[PDB]
Amino acid sequence: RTIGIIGAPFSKGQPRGGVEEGPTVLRKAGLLEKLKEQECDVKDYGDLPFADIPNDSPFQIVKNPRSVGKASEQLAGKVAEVKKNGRISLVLGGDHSLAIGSISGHARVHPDLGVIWVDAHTDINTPLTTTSGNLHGQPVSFLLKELKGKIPDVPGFSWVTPCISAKDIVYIGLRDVDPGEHYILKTLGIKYFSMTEVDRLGIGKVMEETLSYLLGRKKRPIHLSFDVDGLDPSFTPATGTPVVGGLTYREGLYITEEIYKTGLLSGLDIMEVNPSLGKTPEEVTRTVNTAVAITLACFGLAREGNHKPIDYLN
Amino acid sequence: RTIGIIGAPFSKGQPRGGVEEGPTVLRKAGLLEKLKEQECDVKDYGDLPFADIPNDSPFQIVKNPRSVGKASEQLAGKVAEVKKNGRISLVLGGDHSLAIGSISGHARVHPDLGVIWVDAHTDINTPLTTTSGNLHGQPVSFLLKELKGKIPDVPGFSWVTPCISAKDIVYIGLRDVDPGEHYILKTLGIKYFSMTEVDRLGIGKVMEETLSYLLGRKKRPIHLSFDVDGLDPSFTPATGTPVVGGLTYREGLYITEEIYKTGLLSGLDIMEVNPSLGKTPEEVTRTVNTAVAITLACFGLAREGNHKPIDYLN
Amino acid sequence: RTIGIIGAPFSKGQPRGGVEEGPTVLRKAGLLEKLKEQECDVKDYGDLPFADIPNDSPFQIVKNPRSVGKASEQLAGKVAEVKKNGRISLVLGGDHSLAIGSISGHARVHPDLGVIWVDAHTDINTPLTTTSGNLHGQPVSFLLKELKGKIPDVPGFSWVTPCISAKDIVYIGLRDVDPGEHYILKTLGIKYFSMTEVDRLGIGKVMEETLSYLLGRKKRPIHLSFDVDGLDPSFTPATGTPVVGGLTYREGLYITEEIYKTGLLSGLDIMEVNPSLGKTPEEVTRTVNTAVAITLACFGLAREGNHKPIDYLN
Numbered sequence: 001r002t003i004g005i006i007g008a009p010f011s012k013g014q015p016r017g018g019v020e021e022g023p024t025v026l027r028k029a030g031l032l033e034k035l036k037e038q039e040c041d042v043k044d045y046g047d048l049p050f051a052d053i054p055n056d057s058p059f060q061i062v063k064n065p066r067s068v069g070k071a072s073e074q075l076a077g078k079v080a081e082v083k084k085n086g087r088i089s090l091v092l093g094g095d096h097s098l099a100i101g102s103i104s105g106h107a108r109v110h111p112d113l114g115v116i117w118v119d120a121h122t123d124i125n126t127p128l129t130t131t132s133g134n135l136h137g138q139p140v141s142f143l144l145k146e147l148k149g150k151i152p153d154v155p156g157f158s159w160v161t162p163c164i165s166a167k168d169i170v171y172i173g174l175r176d177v178d179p180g181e182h183y184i185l186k187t188l189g190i191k192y193f194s195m196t197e198v199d200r201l202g203i204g205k206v207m208e209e210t211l212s213y214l215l216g217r218k219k220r221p222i223h224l225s226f227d228v229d230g231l232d233p234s235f236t237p238a239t240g241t242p243v244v245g246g247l248t249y250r251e252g253l254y255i256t257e258e259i260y261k262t263g264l265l266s267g268l269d270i271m272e273v274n275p276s277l278g279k280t281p282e283e284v285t286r287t288v289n290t291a292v293a294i295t296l297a298c299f300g301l302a303r304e305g306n307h308k309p310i311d312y313l314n
Numbered sequence: 315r316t317i318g319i320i321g322a323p324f325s326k327g328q329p330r331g332g333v334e335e336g337p338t339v340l341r342k343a344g345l346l347e348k349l350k351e352q353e354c355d356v357k358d359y360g361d362l363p364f365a366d367i368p369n370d371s372p373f374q375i376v377k378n379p380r381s382v383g384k385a386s387e388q389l390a391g392k393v394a395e396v397k398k399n400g401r402i403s404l405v406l407g408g409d410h411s412l413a414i415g416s417i418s419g420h421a422r423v424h425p426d427l428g429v430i431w432v433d434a435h436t437d438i439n440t441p442l443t444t445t446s447g448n449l450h451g452q453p454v455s456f457l458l459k460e461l462k463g464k465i466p467d468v469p470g471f472s473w474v475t476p477c478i479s480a481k482d483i484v485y486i487g488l489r490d491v492d493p494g495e496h497y498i499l500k501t502l503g504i505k506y507f508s509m510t511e512v513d514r515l516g517i518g519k520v521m522e523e524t525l526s527y528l529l530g531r532k533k534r535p536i537h538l539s540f541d542v543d544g545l546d547p548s549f550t551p552a553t554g555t556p557v558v559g560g561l562t563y564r565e566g567l568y569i570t571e572e573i574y575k576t577g578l579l580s581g582l583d584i585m586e587v588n589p590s591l592g593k594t595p596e597e598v599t600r601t602v603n604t605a606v607a608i609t610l611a612c613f614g615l616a617r618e619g620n621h622k623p624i625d626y627l628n
Numbered sequence: 629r630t631i632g633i634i635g636a637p638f639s640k641g642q643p644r645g646g647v648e649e650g651p652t653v654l655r656k657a658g659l660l661e662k663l664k665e666q667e668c669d670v671k672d673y674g675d676l677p678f679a680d681i682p683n684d685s686p687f688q689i690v691k692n693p694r695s696v697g698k699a700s701e702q703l704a705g706k707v708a709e710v711k712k713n714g715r716i717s718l719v720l721g722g723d724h725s726l727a728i729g730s731i732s733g734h735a736r737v738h739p740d741l742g743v744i745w746v747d748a749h750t751d752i753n754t755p756l757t758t759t760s761g762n763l764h765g766q767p768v769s770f771l772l773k774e775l776k777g778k779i780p781d782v783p784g785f786s787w788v789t790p791c792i793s794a795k796d797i798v799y800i801g802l803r804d805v806d807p808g809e810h811y812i813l814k815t816l817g818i819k820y821f822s823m824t825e826v827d828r829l830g831i832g833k834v835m836e837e838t839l840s841y842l843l844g845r846k847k848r849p850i851h852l853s854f855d856v857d858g859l860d861p862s863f864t865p866a867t868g869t870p871v872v873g874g875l876t877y878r879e880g881l882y883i884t885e886e887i888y889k890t891g892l893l894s895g896l897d898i899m900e901v902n903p904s905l906g907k908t909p910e911e912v913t914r915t916v917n918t919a920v921a922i923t924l925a926c927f928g929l930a931r932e933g934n935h936k937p938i939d940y941l942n
């Protein structure tokens with residue numbers, strides 16, 4: 001698979017700052033080398049230079065709106081560039097607010113994309129339903145066409161144009177959804193598989209339904225926004241908003257192995273890895289290592305094994 | 315849902331004493347506040363005052379029979395009171411021997427109840443098949459009509475009257491059943507899903523079958539006796555008789571979320587939480603926190619989220 | 629069930645030496661006593677005396693070929709002896725290279741046997757596809773009839789005769805398969821259930837398919853080669869080649885409980901337990917205890933309980 005790597009060292013979508021170190025620790029773990037170790041054509045576009053916006057007072061309750069808005073506007077441009085280069089954009093991120101730019105830029109080149117959002121959260125709060133004011137919990141609200149008219153004019157997001165319909169996204173792993181968020185899910189008829197559904201059906205059926213749901217009518221590019229807190233904190237502890245009872249390491253790899261097999265992966269986000277939040281050096285490496293494994297699975301690494309098209313017995 | 319909370323600080327059904335602190339640590343974790351935080355009508359009936367019975371020599375091998383018998387007789391009265399008040403009895407317990415009084419009192423108001431027993435143990439030893447002499451491993455034998463005639467006249471239990479038939483109970487999570495207990499299961503035809511069945515069918519099918527088994531003929535009140543050792547000790551370590559390979563945090567919440575959805579939960583027991591047995595301050599909080607989560611799920615807290623009947627988008 | 633215990637304190641199939649202590653720590657944990665505690669007829673044949681072969685230079689890249697070859701030749705003889713005694717051979721092993729002798733000796737008495745290989749690895753590298761040179765990752769290549777002609781004349785294995793066809797073996801738990809190994813799987817059409825298949829179908833369906841696959845045409849003796857690294861290192865950490873995302877404790881017991889129920893278990897290998905690799909005294913006991921539990925399940929210990937054919941209520 002051909003990849004376009006984009007480091008997005010950004011954290012202003014939430015309170016803890018160590019998330020901007022995500023691109024660095026993932027590269028350090030040898031993500032490029034390992035990807036290349038597979039039949040992968042890897043091109044690193046480097047880390048986007050997110051300049052500081054010193055003047056960025058809250059918009060009502062919403063924090064760092066201009067900084068978050070600018071980072072996504074800049075990222076949207078980069079992602080559209082890599083997509084125009086015929087490569088799968090791989091955004092090594094900071095916080096999940098960056099999904100606004102990643103999906104936006106991706107949709108500019110492939111308006112028919114479908115989204116799979118692996119997360120413990122729906123991140124669909126609007127600037128008016130949010131209680132935390134953290135934009136990493138509102139990315140989906142800015143992207144949904146059905147919600148346009150419910151999103152106030154927030155400084156820094158005038159460039160945004162809702163690019164996805166409520167029917168073009170599936171959530172997997174939900175276990176901490178706010179009331180307003182749940183109201184939005186039920187009201188717009190958004191397809192989701194919370195941890196309850198995963199327990200009920202098993203990850204196998206969950207994925208069968210997810211892909212059938214998004215690819216049934218017709219094949220379309222797939223955007224996978226993977227928030228590492230979607231997995232249980234026993235696997236990815238170094239993250240800002242962890243929630244117990246998450247998806248297992250195995251389910252995480254299953255999700256990605258299945259998405260890979262579709263041959264339709266078009267965009268990928270590996271978000272919320274925050275080394276600074278690891279209670280120990282080992283929790284940090286455990287989080288980074290799991291984040292790498294998930295990424296590799298998205299690009300072909302299978303647990304049953306892989307082999308080149310040659311005669312190994314000769 | 316409307317709840318009637320009853321603290322049962324009792325431990326004489328087994329050897330370790332810290333179990334009588336269960337009501338205290340659960341209240342401390344803010345169980346009342348959290349329940350009220352939901353659309354819950356909560357009334358605390360307080361902690362029952364289990365007076366000491368200084369003279370209580372063993373009945374053969376059975377220990378503290380008068381103390382255990384009295385605690386259940388007193389609890390049976392309280393539970394019947396809260397049930398008569400039109401509320402779901404929530405017994406914050408000490409050891410599982412208290413199930414004798416909780417189910418007995420519940421059955422006085424609702425004789426048609428069905429029981430779901432989540433536990434690593436069947437707790438169905440009779441005073442004659444028990445080898446430990448601990449009454450927390452014999453509660454079910456005193457309640458089963460089919461076993462009346464096999465239970466000797468034990469001091470303190472003359473007030474008991476078997477109130478449930480072998481067909482009105484389902485076990486979930488079994489993994490440490492004594493030989494005599496297993497003989498009773500097979501002989502009376504008791505429905506159970508040991509860890510083997512959960513592994514085979516998945517918790518989803520297990521619950522489908524459980525509810526169909528108990529509610530098929532007709533809807534009836536449900537009594538859920540949840541022993542925290544039913545869950546794996548990785549989740550609830552501070553308990554007296556832990557057994558590895560237990561139900562997961564997720565399966566525990568799935569069990570309860572499904573029971574809640576029936577709208578038939580009538581009685582609930584959260585038992586065997588023993589803070590004094592936590593190897594660390596964290597194992598204690600981990601056990602208490604999991605015990606609280608399970609309780610909240612029984613009363614409506616769903617992992618996919620919850621929302622009031624208002625227009626959140628306005 | 630009637631058992632013939634054979635200790636195989638061998639480690640030259642891989643680099644770390646503590647694996648030869650496997651028989652000792654398993655016996656110490658009281659494996660004999662516990663087996664006898666069940667309706668088991670247990671006969672200990674003791675630990676085979678694997679004499680040192682001082683002169684054993686590598687064969688190309690392959691290490692300790694004469695030592696490994698001799699240990700398996702000696703073990704093959706013992707296993708055939710216990711099988712001739714009408715007992716299920718239970719090989720308490722060192723490294724997995726010993727599977728060559730165990731399956732070879734077993735097949736001498738029961739040529740129609742079927743093999744279930746529980747492992748994170750396929751251990752099917754040939755002396756020419758191996759990159760590590762460790763023979764514990766090549767046992768299956770020496771046993772497969774279809775691969776005879778692809779295995780060079782390695783010092784110490786002239787006694788070997790491929791005894792199993794590619795169709796008589798099923799793998800369960802795979803998650804670290806080398807490229808050449810994967811090529812062999814696909815080329816010979818070997819049946820396997822990697823962790824991906826377990827996630828997809830659930831261990832219940834995996835076992836249904838496994839047994840149907842091997843016993844469909846006709847009932848035949850079953851050889852279970854259980855590598856403890858097949859289970860997740862959270863359960864069996866003290867092992868030489870651990871791989872995350874393994875089978876759970878529950879799945880491990882499910883696998884074995886199901887095999888037991890067939891009444892066809894004929895040979896068993898409990899391999900790769902290396903006490904010397906436990907980061908703590910507790911990781912060692914955790915590994916040994918899990919290894920014992922798996923063994924007991926193979927011989928009748930069920931999680932739902934067991935009872936003798938008597939009237940426990942009397």
Ligand SMILES: NCCC[C@H](N)C(=O)O
Nearest residue numbers: 128129130131179180626
């Ligand atoms: N920050 C205003 C409160 C909005 C609330 N989170 C809701 O949508 O229910």
Ligand SMILES: NCCC[C@H](N)C(=O)O
Nearest residue numbers: 121125132134136137241
């Ligand atoms: N990214 C996690 C979001 C957490 C919470 N729902 C919030 O809106 O802040």
Ligand SMILES: NCCC[C@H](N)C(=O)O
Nearest residue numbers: 442443444445493494940
């Ligand atoms: N304490 C008398 C022994 C009874 C034994 N637990 C049985 O029922 O098999």
Ligand SMILES: NCCC[C@H](N)C(=O)O
Nearest residue numbers: 435439446448450451555
């Ligand atoms: N409450 C756990 C019971 C443990 C054992 N079956 C006993 O009878 O003591």
Ligand SMILES: NCCC[C@H](N)C(=O)O
Nearest residue numbers: 312756757758759807808
């Ligand atoms: N040691 C020679 C390299 C063989 C390689 N492991 C392969 O079979 O692809």
Ligand SMILES: NCCC[C@H](N)C(=O)O
Nearest residue numbers: 749753760762764765869
């Ligand atoms: N026994 C584990 C084998 C590991 C690796 N495939 C090897 O051939 O050395």
Ligand SMILES: [Co+2]
Nearest residue numbers: 120121227229
């Ligand atoms: Co999240």
Ligand SMILES: [Co+2]
Nearest residue numbers: 096119123227
């Ligand atoms: Co998120």
Ligand SMILES: [Co+2]
Nearest residue numbers: 434435541543
């Ligand atoms: Co119990």
Ligand SMILES: [Co+2]
Nearest residue numbers: 410433437541
């Ligand atoms: Co119990």
Ligand SMILES: [Co+2]
Nearest residue numbers: 748749855857
């Ligand atoms: Co292995």
Ligand SMILES: [Co+2]
Nearest residue numbers: 724747751855
């Ligand atoms: Co192996």
